[PDB]
Amino acid sequence: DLLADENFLMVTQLHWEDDIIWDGE
Amino acid sequence: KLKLSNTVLPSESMKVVAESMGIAQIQEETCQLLTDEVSYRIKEIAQDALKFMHMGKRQKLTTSDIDYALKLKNVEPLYGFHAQEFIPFRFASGGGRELYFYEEKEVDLSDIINTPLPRVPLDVCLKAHWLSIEGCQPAIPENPPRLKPRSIHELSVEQQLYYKEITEACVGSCEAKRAEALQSIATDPGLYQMLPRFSTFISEGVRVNVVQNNLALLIYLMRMVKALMDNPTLYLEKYVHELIPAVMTCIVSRQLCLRPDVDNHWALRDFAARLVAQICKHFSTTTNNIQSRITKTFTKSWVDEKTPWTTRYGSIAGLAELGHDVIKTLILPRLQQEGERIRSVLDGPVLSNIDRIGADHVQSLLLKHCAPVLAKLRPPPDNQDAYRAEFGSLGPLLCSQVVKARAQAALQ
C-alpha cells in the first residue's frame, strides 16, 4: 500500500510550496 | 458446468390474490397449479420480448418490448385494465403504469398541474465523421480514445508544429485564435505525450512573467491551465506539482506593473486563480497532501503580520472560495483583525499607495462571504443592529444581501 502509484507522484513527494514566488526581486 | 433451474412465482402470493377476490379455501395443489401456469407465461413472454430487443438492436429490454411481445401472443398490451368487449382499445399499448414500490400512493391533483413539463429532446439528425483514414483511426471527439544511433524526439513534426501554433496562439495576440486554441486544448484526445512541454511552458512562463508583472501574459496562462484541466482524456496529477505553485503565485503575488486600474483585472487574475485552485483541490485528492497544504499556506499568509495588501487580498480570495464549511470554520475568529486593518488604512492619509484599494476590496469580499455564512446557519431575525456585536462591519447592508439571497432561494 506504500507501493501504490500515488505515493510516488511528485505532488506528494515534493515541497512545491517553496516554488510559489512571493515578492520576488 | 450449468446449474440452470426453473424458478416460479411463490404460491404464498397466489393465495393472497385468491382470498382477496372472493375465492376462499383453496388447496395447495390448486394453488401450485396457478403459479406454474403464470410463471410459464412470464417466461414465454420474456423469451418473446427478447426477440424485439435483438431486432431493435438494443441490449436493454425496454418497457415497449413487452407491449409488442404481448400483442404477438394475441393478449392485449393493457396492464392496468382489461376490457372484455375489447372494442374501445384493440391491442393498443397505453405505455404501462408509472408506479413504484416506494411511492406515496396519494397525491394532490394540483401538484401534477403546477409542475413544469420535461423538455422534448432534439430530433434525429445525420452527422458523418471518419472511423478510419487509410487504416488509421483519427483522434477526433467522435472516436473513443561505436557510436549510439542518433535519437529522434518523441513528438512528430506535425505535433511539434501543432505545439508551436497552439502556444503562439495562447499568448493572446488575437482573441479568436486564443479561443480556438483554448478549445483545442480543452478537447484534443492526443494531447497526452505533449503535456510535459505544456506544463513546463506554463510553469516557466509564470515565473519569468512575474519578474515584470505582465497581466495579460498571466491571464492567458491561467486560461490555458483551465483549458488543460477540463480535458477528460489526459492524466493531469503527474503534472500538478508544477501547476499548483504557478496558480498560487498568480493569487499571492505583488503586482510590479501599475498598482490601480488593472487591479480590477488583478482581482480577476486572483478570481481565475482561486477558481482553478479550488478546482484543483476538488480533483486530485488523496489523504492530507494537496488541500490541507494549500489551506495551511493560505492561513499563514493571513495570520502573517503587516503583509503586502495585494498578497493579503489574493490570499483572502483564495481562502474564501474553498466551499461551504471552510468559511464556516476559518473566517469566524478573525473579524476584529480585519476591522483593525481597515481602520489603519482609513486613518493614515497616504492615498497614493495601493493600501486603500486593497483594503476596500478585502472588506467587500469578506462582508459578502460573512452574509450567507450567516444566511446559511441562523434565522433572519434582528437584522438591524445585532451585527454590531461583530464590530458593525456590514450590518444592515449585510442584512440586505442576506434578504437578496433569501429572494433568490424563493425564486428557486
Partner: protein, 209 residues
C-alpha cells in the same frame, strides 16, 4: 435523461390533461394509482384512433384520413359522436400548454477548419473533410546538426587549449614548482626542471610512431 424525456414529456402532458379533467369533474387530490390508470387509458385511446382511422382510410385506398374515416372509427369504438359539439363548448375547460421543446435551441455553434489533407479521388467532395494535419499521421524529427567548419575549428581548439591548461596546472600544483614572479603559484605556475640521468633518450626519441 433525454431518452426518458422523449417518452416522459409526452406522458407527463397526458397526466396533466388527466389531472385537469379530474379537477373539472370535482375531484381534488386523487389516488396515485388511479391517475396512472386513467392516463394509460388516455394514451391507449389516442393510439387506437391512430391505428383504426388509418386502417379505415387505407382500406379505401387513401393515405391521410378525412372526417368520414374518424366518424366511422369512433362509431366502431362506441362513442356517440353527436354529443361532442356540446362537450367542446364548456365553460369549465382548461388548456394545458404543450411540453417545452429543446429543438428551439437546436444548434449552439457550427464552424469549419483548414489544413485538412486533400481528398483522394475515391472519396467525393461531399464527404467530411480529413481532420487536422496532426490527428492521424506522424513523421520523426532530429536534432539540429552543427556542420560548420568555423565553429568546429573553434570547439576543437578551445577544448584542446582548456585540457592542456588544466593538465599543466594540475601537474604544477602537485609537484615541485618554479615561478617567474616572487611567490607566484596561483597565476602562471611552472613545472620545475628536473635533470635526467640520460637526456638524449627523452630529447631525440619520437613518442608517437
Amino acid at each position: 435523461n433525454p431518452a426518458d424525456n422523449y417518452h416522459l414529456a409526452r406522458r407527463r402532458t397526458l397526466q396533466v390533461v388527466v389531472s385537469s379533467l379530474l379537477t373539472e369533474a370535482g375531484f381534488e387530490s386523487a389516488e396515485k394509482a388511479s391517475v396512472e390508470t386513467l392516463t394509460e387509458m388516455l394514451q391507449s385511446y389516442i393510439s387506437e384512433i391512430g391505428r383504426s382511422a388509418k386502417s379505415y382510410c387505407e382500406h379505401t385506398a387513401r393515405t391521410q384520413p378525412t372526417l368520414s374515416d374518424i366518424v366511422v372509427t369512433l362509431v366502431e369504438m362506441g362513442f356517440n359522436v353527436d354529443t361532442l359539439p356540446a362537450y367542446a363548448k364548456r365553460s369549465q375547460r382548461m388548456v394545458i400548454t404543450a411540453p417545452p421543446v429543446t429543438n428551439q435551441p437546436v444548434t449552439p455553434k457550427a464552424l469549419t477548419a483548414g489544413q485538412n489533407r486533400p481528398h483522394p479521388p475515391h472519396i467525393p467532395s461531399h464527404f467530411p473533410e480529413f481532420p487536422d494535419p496532426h490527428t492521424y499521421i506522424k513523421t520523426p524529427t532530429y536534432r539540429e546538426p552543427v556542420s560548420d567548419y568555423q565553429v568546429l575549428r573553434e570547439k576543437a581548439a578551445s577544448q584542446r587549449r582548456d585540457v592542456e591548461r588544466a593538465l599543466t596546472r594540475f601537474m604544477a600544483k602537485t609537484g615541485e614548482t618554479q615561478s617567474l614572479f616572487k611567490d607566484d603559484v596561483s597565476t602562471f605556475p611552472l613545472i620545475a626542471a628536473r635533470p635526467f640521468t640520460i637526456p638524449y633518450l627523452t630529447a631525440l626519441l619520437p613518442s608517437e610512431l
